[PDB]
Amino acid sequence: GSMVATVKRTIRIKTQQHILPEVPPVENFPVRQWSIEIVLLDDEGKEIPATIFDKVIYHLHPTFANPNRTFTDPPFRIEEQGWAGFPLDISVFLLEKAGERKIPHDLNFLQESYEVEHVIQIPLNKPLLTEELAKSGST
Amino acid sequence: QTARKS
């Protein structure tokens, strides 16, 4: 029904992490610096700036201070320090108030860096968003 | 590398 009037896009969440040796381990667990960024993929699979979002909010574990962190410019890079991975929620806000999407992400220390792809459905009823969507594929 | 929060 109402979901017919949408296009799909794949976004790629990019995570990196490494130990900070100058930070005392917590219960023998080392503290790590970690970062998350978000890019968009085009129809050929190349990364391009995710300009279809005007805001990203990382909803961090409540062991973090001010755990809801807003970013407004691609690639919406967040950097933090911690000791244990966790599911976090990433809210991405489409241009022109076209809608919030909540992307589940798993922050973990299994790899130095790892990328995860998510498909979102985006409406075609906001002119400025529709023009932006043309940069990443058919509309 | 498998450290995780509750």
Residue numbers in the entry:
A (entry chain A): -1 to 137
B (entry chain B): 5 to 10
Which of the paper's sentences describe this entry?
One of the major and widespread PTMs is acylation of the ε-amino group of lysine residues. In this study, we elucidate the significance of π stacking components in targeting of acetyllysines by the YEATS domains and report a previously uncharacterized DNA-binding activity of the human AF9-YEATS domain.
The structure of the complex showed that the aromatic side chains of W81 and F62 lay parallel to each other and at equal distance of 3.4–3.6 Å from the crotonyl alkene group.
